[PDB]
């Protein structure tokens, strides 16, 4: 697995339908 928070790319997150890169935060 993986620890968070985390940046990565996503489609859909941060206000980004698309696809952009965010953090969890």
């Known amino acids: 697995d ?3 928070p985390i ?3 996503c489609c859909g ?3 980004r339908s698309k ?3 965010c953090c969890k935060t």
């Open 7 to 9: 940046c990565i790319f």
């Open 13 to 15: 997150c941060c206000h």
């Open 2 to 4: 993986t620890h968070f």
């Open 19 to 21: 696809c952009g890169m």
